[PDB]
Amino acid sequence: QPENFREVIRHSPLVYLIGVAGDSGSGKSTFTRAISDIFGEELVSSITVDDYHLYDRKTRSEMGITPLLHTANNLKLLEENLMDLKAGRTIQKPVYLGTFGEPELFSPTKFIIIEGLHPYATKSLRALYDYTIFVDPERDVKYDWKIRRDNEVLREILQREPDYFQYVFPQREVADAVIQISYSSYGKEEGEKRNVYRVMLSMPAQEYCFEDIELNIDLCDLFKKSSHDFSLSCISHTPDSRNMRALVVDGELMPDTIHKIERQIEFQTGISPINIFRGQEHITGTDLVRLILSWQIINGRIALSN
Amino acid sequence: NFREVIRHSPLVYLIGVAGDSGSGKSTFTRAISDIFGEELVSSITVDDYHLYDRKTRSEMGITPLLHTANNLKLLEENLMDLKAGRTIQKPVYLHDHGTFGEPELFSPTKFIIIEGLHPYATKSLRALYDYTIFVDPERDVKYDWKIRRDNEVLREILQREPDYFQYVFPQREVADAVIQISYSSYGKEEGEKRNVYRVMLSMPAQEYCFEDIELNIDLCDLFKKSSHDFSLSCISHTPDSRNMRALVVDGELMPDTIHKIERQIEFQTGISPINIFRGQEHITGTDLVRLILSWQIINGRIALSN
Numbered sequence: 344q345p346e347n348f349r350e351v352i353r354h355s356p357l358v359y360l361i362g363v364a365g366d367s368g369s370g371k372s373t374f375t376r377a378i379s380d381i382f383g384e385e386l387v388s389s390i391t392v393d394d395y396h397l398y399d400r401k402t403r404s405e406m407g408i409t410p411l412l413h414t415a416n417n418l419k420l421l422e423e424n425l426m427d428l429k430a431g432r433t434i435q436k437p438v439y440l441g442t443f444g445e446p447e448l449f450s451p452t453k454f455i456i457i458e459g460l461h462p463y464a465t466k467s468l469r470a471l472y473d474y475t476i477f478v479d480p481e482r483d484v485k486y487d488w489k490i491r492r493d494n495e496v497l498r499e500i501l502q503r504e505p506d507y508f509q510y511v512f513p514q515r516e517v518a519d520a521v522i523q524i525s526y527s528s529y530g531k532e533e534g535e536k537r538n539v540y541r542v543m544l545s546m547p548a549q550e551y552c553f554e555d556i557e558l559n560i561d562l563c564d565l566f567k568k569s570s571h572d573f574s575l576s577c578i579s580h581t582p583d584s585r586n587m588r589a590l591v592v593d594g595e596l597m598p599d600t601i602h603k604i605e606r607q608i609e610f611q612t613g614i615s616p617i618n619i620f621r622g623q624e625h626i627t628g629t630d631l632v633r634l635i636l637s638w639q640i641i642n643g644r645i646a647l648s649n
Numbered sequence: 650n651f652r653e654v655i656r657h658s659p660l661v662y663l664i665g666v667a668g669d670s671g672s673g674k675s676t677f678t679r680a681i682s683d684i685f686g687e688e689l690v691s692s693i694t695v696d697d698y699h700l701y702d703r704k705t706r707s708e709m710g711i712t713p714l715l716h717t718a719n720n721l722k723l724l725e726e727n728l729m730d731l732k733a734g735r736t737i738q739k740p741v742y743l744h745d746h747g748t749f750g751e752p753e754l755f756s757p758t759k760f761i762i763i764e765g766l767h768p769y770a771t772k773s774l775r776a777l778y779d780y781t782i783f784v785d786p787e788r789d790v791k792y793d794w795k796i797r798r799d800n801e802v803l804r805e806i807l808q809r810e811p812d813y814f815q816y817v818f819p820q821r822e823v824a825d826a827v828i829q830i831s832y833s834s835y836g837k838e839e840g841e842k843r844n845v846y847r848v849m850l851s852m853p854a855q856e857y858c859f860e861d862i863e864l865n866i867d868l869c870d871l872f873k874k875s876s877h878d879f880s881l882s883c884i885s886h887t888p889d890s891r892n893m894r895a896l897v898v899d900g901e902l903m904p905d906t907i908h909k910i911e912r913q914i915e916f917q918t919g920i921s922p923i924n925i926f927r928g929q930e931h932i933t934g935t936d937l938v939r940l941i942l943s944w945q946i947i948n949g950r951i952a953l954s955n
Binding site: 546552555561563564565566573574575578579 | 852854855856858861862863864865866867868869870871872873874876878879880881882883884885892894896900910941944948
């Protein structure tokens with residue numbers, strides 16, 4: 344008999360912890376939102392590791408200390424809070440805003456997303472997570488998104504890079520999913536123009552598949568003129584001394600390629616519609632990786648009931 | 650429904666397959682017949698129309714790729730007769746040593762495949778076909794299936810290249826489907842070892858889809874350690890200065906990725922099962938492309954009866 348996500352979590356008080364790590368301006372929140380939208384406000388609540396800064400915006404500047412350092416964050420208090428949450432206990436947690444705010448009384452939900460620079464920077468913190476994601480875009484893409492927001496700021500970037508590699512980058516080595524967005528081999532311009540990027544999803548050996556989850560490509564449609572280009576591939580690679588398989592999507596696909604995937608995810612979460620969260624005319628690599636990631640969480644939650 | 654369309658229709662569907670010697674035509678022709686069945690499909694090799702045998706051609710220092718070395722005018726006469734539904738008497742060339750054989754009687758079938766060096770080498774001949782295919786493998790690939798396949802070959806290859814470009818290559822521009830094979834972006838040894846090559850199928854403006862034909866890629870399996878590498882992409886290139894779109898397949902796909910496509914072909918042809926005709930453990934770019942073209946033929950036959 345097929346298994347059901349909602350069946351698995353109703354009978355259990357188990358708190359599923361999800362970590363989302365990455366450098367600032369790394370596009371972390373686009374994935375945090377994705378998980379929330381897809382799973383709903385009742386199942387999901389999140390926390391940002393920023394709430395655990397030891398120093399405030401002001402003092403840090405005077406100390407010339409950057410937030411990328413571990414000793415610049417209350418990682419001991421975070422681990423303390425997370426362990427309590429897992430046990431289902433309510434917690435009183437700090438709150439950042441550019442300064443400290445009134446502490447909060449945060450209470451558990453079936454799914455909690457811990458998003459920040461060091462969600463699982465230590466072995467102790469790592470061992471608490473049931474699912475970890477690391478967002479690692481290419482340098483040129485990431486800094487562009489920075490200018491698009493903020494040369495005028497070229498020092499900040501290069502200045503903090505060594506800290507990022509020393510204190511944030513390691514988490515990449517122990518993440519259940521690693522996402523790297525780069526420029527499409529169809530042009531950098533397609534990046535902000537149509538949000539078409541060459542996205543890659545890297546994951547360790549798949550230990551379990553609770554159900555078929557298929558992408559349906561019509562082999563007659565792609566021959567029609569006006570048909571948009573796309574590339575989908577999967578090849579083995581060995582990042583950070585570890586074996587992984589990388590799914591690489593590029594270009595755009597017709598919405599009909601993911602109708603079943605969306606329907607199957609909706610039925611499972613009982614949250615719909617979710618087609619409102621992606622493009623109406625064409626589906627991109629980021630969109631597809633968002634659904635795969637989301638399905639990987641359901642899968643992983645069901646694998647856990649077993 | 651395919652089977653019933655060819656029911657009350659004396660019409661003869663003429664399929665042409667051109668390409669240099671040792672390019673896989675013969676094995677592509679065989680795949681089609683396996684899918685449409687021996688009762689519906691019949692075939693002819695244009696080689697039966699050589700005017701000079703192997704011994705003679707050596708003396709002359711001539712190559713069989715010349716139009717003047719072939720009785721193309723007879724082939725055309727035979728084809729027109731065949732299309733009208735009349736039995737013909739045609740020549741036979743025994744490749745055992747390169748000698749002429751005894752003439753044969755060939756009576757029309759509703760599907761006739763004409764595979765050879767010059768199936769439609771003349772504007773006149775092209776006019777008779779309903780669907781034309783050009784197999785165009787890369788040089789090292791094309792020669793491999795020869796120099797190691799069978800130094801007569803060496804010297805004969807040097808001697809043919811010019812004639813190829815002059816008497817065979819022109820057909821590629823007027824073909825409905827162009828198939829290009831080159832060494833896989835993976836093991837260039839896998840071509841001989843697992844029939845894994847990088848295959849590209851180009852066709853002009855795609856309009857009219859008898860029905861949906863979709864490839865079902867499972868997005869969980871591909872992350873399984875035992876999963877094989879593959880890539881699927883669709884671009885728009887312009888060989889011979891014309892607008893075509895190309896499906897590029899490389900690597901291996903699981904068999905169930907094409908289970909529905911197979912069942913849909915089996916349903917229309919009445920011939921089954923057809924999984925005996927392709928990898929039993931893995932699908933190659935070549936297995937898939939054969940399925941697609943046999944499906945384009947059906948689609949072409951249903952279209953023609955509209």
